[PDB]
Amino acid sequence: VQEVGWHDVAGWLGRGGSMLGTKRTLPKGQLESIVENIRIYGIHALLVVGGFEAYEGVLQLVEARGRYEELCIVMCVIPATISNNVPGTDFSLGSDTAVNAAMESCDRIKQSASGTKRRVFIVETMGGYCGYLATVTGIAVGADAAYVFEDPFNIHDLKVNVEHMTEKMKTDIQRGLVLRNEKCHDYYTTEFLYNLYSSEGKGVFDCRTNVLGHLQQGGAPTP
Amino acid sequence: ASGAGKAIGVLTSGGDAQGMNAAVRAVTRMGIYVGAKVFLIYEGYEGLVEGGENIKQANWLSVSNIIQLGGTIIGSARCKAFTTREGRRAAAYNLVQHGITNLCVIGGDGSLTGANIFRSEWGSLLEELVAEGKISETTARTYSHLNIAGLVGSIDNDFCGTDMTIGTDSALHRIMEVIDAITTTAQSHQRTFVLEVMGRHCGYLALVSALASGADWLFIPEAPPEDGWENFMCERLGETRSRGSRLNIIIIAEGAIDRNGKPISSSYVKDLVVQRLGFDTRVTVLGHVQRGGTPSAFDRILSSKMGMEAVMALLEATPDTPACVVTLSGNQSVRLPLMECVQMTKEVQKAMDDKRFDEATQLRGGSFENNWNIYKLLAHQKPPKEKSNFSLAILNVGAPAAGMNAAVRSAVRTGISHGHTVYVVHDGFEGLAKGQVQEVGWHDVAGWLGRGGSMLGTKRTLPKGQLESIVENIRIYGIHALLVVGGFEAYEGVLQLVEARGRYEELCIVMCVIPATISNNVPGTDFSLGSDTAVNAAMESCDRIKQSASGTKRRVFIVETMGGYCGYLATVTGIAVGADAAYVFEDPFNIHDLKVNVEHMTEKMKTDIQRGLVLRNEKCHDYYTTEFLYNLYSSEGKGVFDCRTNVLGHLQQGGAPTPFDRNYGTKLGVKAMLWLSEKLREVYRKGRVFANAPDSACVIGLKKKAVAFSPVTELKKDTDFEHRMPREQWWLSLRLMLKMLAQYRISMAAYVSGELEHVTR
Amino acid sequence: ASGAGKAIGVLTSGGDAQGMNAAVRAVTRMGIYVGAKVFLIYEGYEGLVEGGENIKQANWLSVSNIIQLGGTIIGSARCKAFTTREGRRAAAYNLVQHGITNLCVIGGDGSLTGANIFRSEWGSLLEELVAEGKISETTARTYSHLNIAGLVGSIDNDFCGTDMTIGTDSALHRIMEVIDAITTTAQSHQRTFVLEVMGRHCGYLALVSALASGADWLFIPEAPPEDGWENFMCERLGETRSRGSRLNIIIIAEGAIDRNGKPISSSYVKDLVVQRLGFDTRVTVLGHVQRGGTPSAFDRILSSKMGMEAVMALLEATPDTPACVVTLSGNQSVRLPLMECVQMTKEVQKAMDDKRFDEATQLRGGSFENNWNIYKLLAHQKPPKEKSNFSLAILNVGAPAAGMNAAVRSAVRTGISHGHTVYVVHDGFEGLAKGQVQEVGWHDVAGWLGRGGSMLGTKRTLPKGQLESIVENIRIYGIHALLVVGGFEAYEGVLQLVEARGRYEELCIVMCVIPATISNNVPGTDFSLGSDTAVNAAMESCDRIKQSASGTKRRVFIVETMGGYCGYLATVTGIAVGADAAYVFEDPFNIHDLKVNVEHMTEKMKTDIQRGLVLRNEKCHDYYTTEFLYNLYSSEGKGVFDCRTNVLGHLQQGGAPTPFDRNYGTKLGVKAMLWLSEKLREVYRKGRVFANAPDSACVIGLKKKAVAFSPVTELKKDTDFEHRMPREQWWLSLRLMLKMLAQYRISMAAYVSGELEHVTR
Ligand SMILES: Nc1ncnc2c1ncn2[C@@H]1O[C@H](COP(=O)(O)OP(=O)(O)OP(=O)(O)O)[C@@H](O)[C@H]1O
Ligand SMILES: Nc1ncnc2c1ncn2[C@@H]1O[C@H](COP(=O)(O)OP(=O)(O)OP(=O)(O)O)[C@@H](O)[C@H]1O
Ligand SMILES: Nc1ncnc2c1ncn2[C@@H]1O[C@H](COP(=O)(O)OP(=O)(O)OP(=O)(O)O)[C@@H](O)[C@H]1O
Ligand SMILES: Nc1ncnc2c1ncn2[C@@H]1O[C@H](COP(=O)(O)OP(=O)(O)OP(=O)(O)O)[C@@H](O)[C@H]1O
Ligand SMILES: Nc1ncnc2c1ncn2[C@@H]1O[C@H](COP(=O)(O)OP(=O)(O)OP(=O)(O)O)[C@@H](O)[C@H]1O
Ligand SMILES: Nc1ncnc2c1ncn2[C@@H]1O[C@H](COP(=O)(O)OP(=O)(O)OP(=O)(O)O)[C@@H](O)[C@H]1O
Ligand SMILES: Nc1ncnc2c1ncn2[C@@H]1O[C@H](COP(=O)(O)OP(=O)(O)OP(=O)(O)O)[C@@H](O)[C@H]1O
Ligand SMILES: O=P(O)(O)OC[C@H]1O[C@](O)(COP(=O)(O)O)[C@@H](O)[C@@H]1O
Ligand SMILES: O=P(O)(O)OC[C@H]1O[C@](O)(COP(=O)(O)O)[C@@H](O)[C@@H]1O
Ligand SMILES: O=P(O)(O)OC[C@H]1O[C@](O)(COP(=O)(O)O)[C@@H](O)[C@@H]1O
Ligand SMILES: [Mg+2]
Ligand SMILES: [Mg+2]
């Protein structure tokens, strides 16, 4: 714990990531140490800027108020995560940046087939089980499909979408793009969709794969 | 051989050209690699004068994680003290206090002029210093010679002896990022975009911006407009409207003048266009933005190369050799004496002061005059009253590459200018077999500069399977010459046509390959058209990936690049991003090398540097795939770092061409068309074209110092057709710099540094 | 410590028990590993007598690729010369000519009796030899002591001091391969199958074959049938028909006799059954087939272990220690003096010659008498006039394991015999919660011995979730005891019920866990029921895979075994197949170890050996998967060998139980039921059963020497619940033997050999 001043945060606006360190560790394990440090530093309020772990940790401290008097401090959670998976908000802080980075990669990937070539790209997005990032990115980029956990899909839906893509690629649009959320399906992975689209699209279109890993994460914040 | 027992000082002065940090990093790490002590002099000649705290010895981690930073971590300052001997003597004193007999100066023309005057007075300054009693006579006989290796770091490119300076490419990136915001928009109103760029006494950035963006008009101090240009410009913009072109681009240097001394302001050009045309006219002024942003890939590679070469030049320099400027003419590293370059800069300045003003533009360099002539030629269609029976077809073959469209644009305009009947064929050799040939005009390539990929279709198919159809369509359309803009399949296809000449008389036509590919795998050139764009996209992704681990977390990223068996893209990208290792096919590696590199990564990762980055070429190894390296690094790095993976697929491919690729494709399309015309006239006899000699089928080639037409038959010896790459690639020496900058103790006795060369008048 | 400067002789004599090659291989490789010279004596005591060419020094490759071969590459012969001193002196001479003061004899009772008489006369033979002038007095004071380490290699198991002999398990594999051909078909006619087994003086094979196959009747010389057995047997076969059992099995030893000396022939038993029953009766005579086929997994492991222990015992043996026989009683290695074992063999032979004939069966060993009593008890339902209020439920929990059915069959018969009310619950704890409890009878388990998997259902679900349902069903059905046959989940579930006794009174019932799993990962035992079957299936796959190159191409196979985090299955399978390496979780390995092993393989593969084999446990490493090892071995072995991969999935699982597993599950099922009955009577008080102490919930063991009962609460200390295996596993010392047989120089000071033990009367 370090007391901070006005100019200690100077120029922190445009800096991406976290000047303060981030850790995913929940407070329940080291709850004795947390109450001790709150007592030592006289912490009367707690501002937690982070993702689902931030909300969950503040929830653990609230539930532990009954055991520890020191945890009866005002708490506030600022939802800040790529996935936009924090309850209580519509937009987690930094989801917009991830969406912008994701579409920029998808626009680049879609731009790479050129002229006559008919090609579909399976792009894998992050976001855990939260499909928000995939779906909005699919809207922004004109993706044909954004497979997400919240909309469970089986092989019947896949054949429908692949035949839909095949008929579309016979039309004058030549660059299909489907998004796959990383945790949308247990078995129908990005490799599965690559095999499916490339097999059924034989003689109509080629298929390629790009897993946007941490290309969606480290960028500076959007305005 | 090693420079032990001697100290190297590195300073930056002038405007903080982006890419300076890369040069400083390479100077520092090479200097302590070779055993020399490296001292960082902060604020430039300012801190040289005051000294003391401003001169600090550098370690390997002092220049860590700066290669992607613009500006300069050393800092630069304008000091008048270095102009006078009172402060210059203090500068010489402070160098003697640290035993710094070796100085690297990274700056503009004024910086290097000051460095030249500082060397010229170094003996006199030391004599007066010992006379005044601040240094003993002993300790002054040593340090009697000051070694200066100059690096030209500036966006201006005002130093006449030097062709390319650090930060010019990135300043051009900033300019073209702004112009692409205008041109890539779906044009709605009729509007004029006036761009003001910072060059007050050099119009090079204004020129290369105008050539890259296809500007309608250019104001530069080197060639002021003739009297009555007001009407001539407004009429040009008028016919531009009549063409249906909804956007006009005016590039105006800050130093824009008329034939007299009166400057031409961007506001004047605005109000002029508004009054006579009524177009929605707004001035864009970049200002400080030109020096901003990250350095481009070219700037990082070249700054690293020149910084390394600066150190090496500084160690092999005896008391007799003069102060040198480490620069690259073409692709070839060279050292130019500081005095001659300063003298040329003074001559061009005097010429520009209404002495030899019409003949000052030539002394700026043949590149400047050539660039301006190419710009004006491609800008406006002049009437080609000359005509020729010759007819030529332009192909795009292989994968699409950024800058194919720039090359095709220039080839079309230049061929029309020479009176040739220019055709394009879509889908490459597939369309030439299928007769997909179309005669093309001047405006049919309009706005093709900034378009990535290929406006013509591209196909990888080789001509041997449809040789009958190709000769048929050549006969039908009377194709006397064939320009093929493409990758390894372009060269191989032209080769198959040359070999097939003996069977088919119709194939005895002049052929020219412009190499255009991401992989840079075409023999007969050092850079393929669009390799620069791929490298820039690759580092941008790698920089983004490397920035994702926040400052606490220790993580290594395995990033997989394209390029086939050609490792060029992986290795230069590793230099640009400071990758620890770039695994490539041309440097075969086994599990012993992997354990060495992983242990090297582990030890490095225990120090203050927390983000590692190893690159892997897609076809470097049969078994040690990206997944293999991931498992290896993550297993052996357990308890030290985590490992992540990112296969840059077509993220390296589809981008719009970088400004280098636009200008480079522009120039090669011109040069190919010039050589096509010359060869066709040389080969036209008996009333028909009969191109049978091997010299009639060349790759345009940028090789070492100059453009060089290499016959495809001759290149067949040095071509690995199985791996689709040349056998001897110039860039394998850059691996040594890559490995050196990542602390690998590699005996780089095989690296060849550019030698002293006098300025080319 | 090392046995340098001394020579070891190894010979085989008698019938060529399969697994002799494994023992010879281990003797040779351990002998030259510890620095001693190894001499192979061909044709046994024959070549000992003639000597000369028949005694050849061994190298490492002399015993290469023989572990899977039956018979003996050394060859065996019956020689009468060794019976007489004339040839025995020549044998002592030939040993002295090579300086062989150390002899390993791998043979039957006659072989080891001859070795005993040869040691007893070694001093007298040497004295008479020097007296006759064939060796000087010097060179005879050295070699004055001959060290004998005996190995019992025979299918008979006639050597009384020893419990298990090499080839017994594989002879039983042959027998049960033939009986399974009869029993596993869909039975059509009423038929009788009389099996004549080749034991002319020992009936052990006939007995364990009868127990494993559930024979209707057994003729053995140790217990001849009572007078009038003709009628008693025929009536038994008659009620067998009335039951609807369409097949009868008669096991008749070659040495079958009546209470007088008259032998009972298989033809007589055939014609007898034909005349009185009319069943389709044919005699099967195995003959030489019993010594045929490959050695079983057990035979290969134990032959390797005893061969290694024979060498070590032969080096640590001073002039005073007597001739020893290296054997295993239970799972524990032991050394027994050769003289006492020979004396016991003579006593049993004299007893069998109508001296103490009724009391000869006990001197054969307690295991023989217990096996025969278990056989007769399980064969025919005798009327249990005793009854008890106790009732017990038999569970199958976890994955299916070969031999669960044999255990449940024995538990059912033994419980019914003791008057208990036996229930079986289908699907384990799931059914106990769901109340799938079905009272079972004698014939409901008929023919369950040879059936693999689980007739009762198996589920992995632990009882904690549905604990209310479990206590309810225990209350409903009045379950006083619980027999849980299964893997780690069986032990864990019984542990959960014991820990929940404090909450629920109904759970204070006697519990017993029979460990039954492929992985051998259950604490409290050395061999889980069905691990032997998995090992045998895994080596048979590995032998098939290793044979696929057929000596021409040289290739390495990465085979992946099951077993979870427990490496037992991989390591023993590697021993059985001569695998170069068995990577396991319990022996963590990094890339340095992998490079050592791959370079080791490469060097070996350049020699005469062409088929490499490394095993990988499925969960040995997080990152260095089977694909990783494939890439590694294939890359580093480039130009030396190719690499292939085979993931043995459920090929190791669904097989029918091996004869060991059938007999083992039979015996511990009986023993668990005996212990259940004793504990339930010891715990019955106040008119109800209340089992609260920790001793009332045990895992039936066989942990070092004999069967044990480890309380589940006590085993909780030595259980790694995260990895589902015990923390200290007995078999990690076998890794050193595995690595030594593969030329890995490993300091095996941690290996403990069996010490001298006197015979147990
Ligand atoms: N994206 C960035 N990454 C790293 N450092 C940054 C970034 N942006 C600004 N900085 C640093 O922040 C420092 C502080 O100056 P800055 O211009 O950013 O704001 P400030 O005037 O000091 O205070 P304030 O936050 O209120 O605007 C600068 O020296 C600059 O190096
Ligand atoms: N003739 C000279 N003699 C001595 N020192 C000089 C001379 N000219 C410039 N300098 C020194 O070099 C420093 C920087 O020079 P300058 O102002 O011309 O910028 P620069 O090096 O040319 O870079 P840029 O053109 O990109 O802005 C000056 O502060 C000055 O101290
Ligand atoms: N795109 C342009 N930008 C700037 N100046 C231009 C451009 N095009 C023409 N000019 C200038 O306008 C003047 C007259 O143009 P024009 O080419 O039509 O006549 P010219 O006598 O043939 O000149 P040139 O030597 O180039 O052939 C020249 O001074 C030329 O430099
Ligand atoms: N990156 C781009 N992608 C797609 N279309 C583009 C791109 N850049 C320019 N264009 C298009 O090119 C068209 C032609 O106008 P443009 O401004 O580009 O040059 P021009 O004046 O017509 O001729 P010139 O090539 O000589 O410069 C524009 O209408 C614009 O839509
Ligand atoms: N009392 C003895 N003294 C000396 N040598 C003996 C004696 N008994 C057997 N041998 C020797 O050991 C050799 C093999 O013995 P034997 O015929 O009894 O077979 P075995 O060792 O018992 O093996 P198996 O029973 O499986 O067939 C004989 O050829 C004989 O030379
Ligand atoms: N499956 C069998 N195989 C061989 N002999 C058998 C079998 N069952 C019974 N016998 C023999 O038949 C004889 C009488 O059998 P039975 O068990 O019914 O009477 P018993 O007096 O009680 O003998 P036991 O001592 O075993 O209890 C015994 O000598 C026994 O050894
Ligand atoms: N491996 C097997 N798989 C399936 N069924 C089997 C197998 N072995 C035996 N059986 C079946 O078991 C049935 C019962 O007869 P079985 O010969 O096996 O023993 P039994 O005489 O009836 O009683 P006991 O178990 O005491 O020996 C047979 O009908 C046979 O079909
Ligand atoms: O969903 P979170 O947990 O709030 O954080 C988002 C980030 O974490 C991720 O799960 C990936 O993190 P890691 O790369 O470290 O495994 C992605 O969803 C995303 O990059
Ligand atoms: O090396 P080339 O053949 O000249 O073209 C470069 C492009 O082709 C590639 O091989 C990949 O092309 P594809 O995606 O169609 O398979 C890459 O090396 C690169 O994207
Ligand atoms: O170790 P367990 O759990 O006792 O059972 C052994 C069997 O279970 C396994 O884990 C595999 O089971 P599954 O195929 O159903 O996944 C193997 O180890 C083996 O086949
Ligand atoms: Mg300057
Ligand atoms: Mg015998």
From Swiss-Prot, chains B, C:
Ways its activity is controlled: Allosterically activated by ADP, AMP, or fructose 2,6-bisphosphate, and allosterically inhibited by ATP or citrate. GlcNAcylation by OGT overcomes allosteric regulation.
Pathway assigned to this chain's UniProt record: Carbohydrate degradation; glycolysis; D-glyceraldehyde 3-phosphate and glycerone phosphate from D-glucose: step 3/4
Catalytic activity: beta-D-fructose 6-phosphate + ATP = beta-D-fructose 1,6-bisphosphate + ADP + H(+)
Keywords tagged on the record: Acetylation, Allosteric enzyme, ATP-binding, Cytoplasm, Glycolysis, Glycoprotein, Kinase, Magnesium, Metal-binding, Nucleotide-binding, Phosphoprotein, Transferase
One Pfam short name: PFK
Gene Ontology cellular component annotations, sorted alphabetically: 6-phosphofructokinase complex; cytosol; extracellular exosome; extracellular region; ficolin-1-rich granule lumen; membrane; secretory granule lumen
Residue span of region Interdomain linker: 381-390
Catalytic EC class: transferase
Intrachain disulfide bonds: none
Residues that coordinate or bind ATP: 15, 78-79, 108-111
Subcellular location: Cytoplasm
Family indicated by similarity: Belongs to the phosphofructokinase type A (PFKA) family. ATP-dependent PFK group I subfamily. Eukaryotic two domain clade 'E' sub-subfamily.
Matching NCBIfam families: 6PF1K_euk (TIGR02478), PRK03202.1 (NF002872)
Known role: Catalyzes the phosphorylation of D-fructose 6-phosphate to fructose 1,6-bisphosphate by ATP, the first committing step of glycolysis. Negatively regulates the phagocyte oxidative burst in response to bacterial infection by controlling cellular NADPH biosynthesis and NADPH oxidase-derived reactive oxygen species. Upon macrophage activation, drives the metabolic switch toward glycolysis, thus preventing glucose turnover that produces NADPH via pentose phosphate pathway.
Other remarks in the entry: In human PFK exists as a system of 3 types of subunits, PFKM (muscle), PFKL (liver) and PFKP (platelet) isoenzymes. Glycosylation may play a role in cancer cell proliferation: inhibition of 6-phosphofructokinase activity and subsequent redirection of the glucose flux through the oxidative pentose phosphate pathway confers a selective growth advantage on cancer cells. Moreover GlcNAcylation is observed in multiple cancer cell lines and tissue samples and GlcNAcylation leads to larger xenografts tunors in mice.
Assembly information from the UniProt record: Homo- and heterotetramers. Phosphofructokinase (PFK) enzyme functions as a tetramer composed of different combinations of 3 types of subunits, called PFKM (where M stands for Muscle), PFKL (Liver) and PFKP (Platelet). The composition of the PFK tetramer differs according to the tissue type it is present in. In muscles, it is composed of 4 PFKM subunits (also called M4). In the liver, the predominant form is a tetramer of PFKL subunits (L4). In erythrocytes, both PFKM and PFKL subunits randomly tetramerize to form M4, L4 and other combinations (ML3, M2L2, M3L).
Protein name: ATP-dependent 6-phosphofructokinase, liver type
Organism: Homo sapiens
Organismal lineage: Eukaryota, Metazoa, Chordata, Craniata, Vertebrata
